[PDB]
């Protein structure tokens, strides 16, 4: 009996922003005027001009291998 | 008995923004005027001009491989 | 008995925005005027000019292999 | 001008299991035998004899009133 | 001008298990025998004999009033 | 001008298990035998005989009043 399995396989995730070219990106002028506002609960606010954003909660990788020889 | 399986396979995810060209993207002017506003519950706000956004909760990658030889 | 399966497969997902060319995209001028508004529940708000957005919850990848030799 | 609306209303939900009588309910004998099982997947398993279960995602209640007098 | 609106209303949820009688409820004998089992992912298991269960994600209650007098 | 609105209303949630009678509930005998088991991921297990369970994520209560007099 000769048990010689070969795993030579590849398991790859490429997730998010990759290999992109951004040549001279111009964000515009941004003006925010706020007067006499009331907030009675949680506020989360973002003000910008140019943003690049990547989260990637994903791209997770999972390999399970089992080898049994019974005689 | 000779047991010589070969896995040479490739298992790949390419997820999100990739290999893109963004040549001279121009965001416009943004003006926000807020006056006399009332909010009684959670506020989440974004103000911008030019955005690139990739989330990728996906692109996850699962391999299961079982070998049994029973004599 | 000779057991010699060969797996040489490719299992590939390409999901989202890829290989795109965006040449001189111009976002327009955006003006938002909000006066005397009342909100009694959750607000989620986005103001922009030019956006690129990719979510990709998908593109997930799953391979299962079982090899049995019983004698 | 006299503005004297009277609201004496009831808005009621009764949802799930209520006002029931269960007299000497007898669960049977339960035997589960599991041998040589393989699971490649999420397993959610319940073994019991006698159950009473109420979920009630519903029964939600919503009342909106607006009173305007303009002169 | 006499603005004397009256609210005397009731807004009620009764959700889940209530006012029930369970008289001598008998769970049976439960036997679980598990041999040589393999699990490759998340397992959630419950073994019992007699259960009473109430979830109630629901039964939520929401009242909104607006009163305007404008002159 | 006489603005004398009266709220005398009630806004109530009764959620879960309440006003129930459980008279001599009998859990049965429970036997769990496990031999030669393999688990490769998170296990959550509950073994009991008699259970009473109430979660109640719900039953939430929300009242908004706005009173305006403008002259």
From Swiss-Prot, chains A, B, C, D, E, F:
The modification N6-acetyllysine is found at residues 4, 10, 14, 24, 36, 40, 62. The modification Omega-N-methylarginine is found at residue 42. The modification N6,N6-dimethyllysine is found at residue 4. Expressed in neurons. Isoform PNS-tau is expressed in the peripheral nervous system while the others are expressed in the central nervous system. The modification Phosphoserine is found at residues 17, 45, 49. It comes from the Eukaryota. Phosphorylation at serine and threonine residues in S-P or T-P motifs by proline-directed protein kinases (PDPK1, CDK1, CDK5, GSK3, MAPK) (only 2-3 sites per protein in interphase, seven-fold increase in mitosis, and in the form associated with paired helical filaments (PHF-tau)), and at serine residues in K-X-G-S motifs by MAP/microtubule affinity-regulating kinase (MARK1, MARK2, MARK3 or MARK4), causing detachment from microtubules, and their disassembly. Phosphorylation decreases with age. The record marks 4, 10, 14, 24, 33, 36, 63, 68 as: Not glycated. Tau/MAP repeats lie at residues 1-29, 30-61. It is found in: Cytoplasm, Cytosol; Cell membrane; Cytoplasm, Cytoskeleton; Cell projection, Axon. Glycans are attached at residues 40, 46, 62. Interacts with MARK1, MARK2, MARK3 and MARK4. Interacts with PSMC2 through SQSTM1. Interacts with SQSTM1 when polyubiquitinated. Interacts with FKBP4. Binds to CSNK1D. Interacts with SGK1. Interacts with PIN1. Interacts with LRRK2. Interacts with LRP1, leading to endocytosis; this interaction is reduced in the presence of LRPAP1/RAP. It is linked to In Alzheimer disease, the neuronal cytoskeleton in the brain is progressively disrupted and replaced by tangles of paired helical filaments (PHF) and straight filaments, mainly composed of hyperphosphorylated forms of TAU (PHF-TAU or AD P-TAU). O-GlcNAcylation is greatly reduced in Alzheimer disease brain cerebral cortex leading to an increase in TAU/MAPT phosphorylations. The tau/MAP repeat binds to tubulin. Type I isoforms contain 3 repeats while type II isoforms contain 4 repeats. Promotes microtubule assembly and stability, and might be involved in the establishment and maintenance of neuronal polarity. The C-terminus binds axonal microtubules while the N-terminus binds neural plasma membrane components, suggesting that tau functions as a linker protein between both. Axonal polarity is predetermined by TAU/MAPT localization (in the neuronal cell) in the domain of the cell body defined by the centrosome. The short isoforms allow plasticity of the cytoskeleton whereas the longer isoforms may preferentially play a role in its stabilization. This is Microtubule-associated protein tau. It comes from Homo sapiens.
């Amino acid at each position: 009996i000769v048990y010689k399995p070969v795993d030579l396989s590849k398991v790859t995730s490429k997730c998010g922003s990759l290999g992109n070219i951004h040549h001279k990106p111009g964000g515009g002028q941004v003006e925010v005027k706020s007067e006499k506002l009331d907030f009675k609960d949680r506020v989360q606010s973002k003000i910008g001009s140019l943003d690049n954003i990547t989260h990637v909660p994903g791209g997770g990788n999972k390999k399970i291998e089992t080898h049994k020889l019974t005689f």
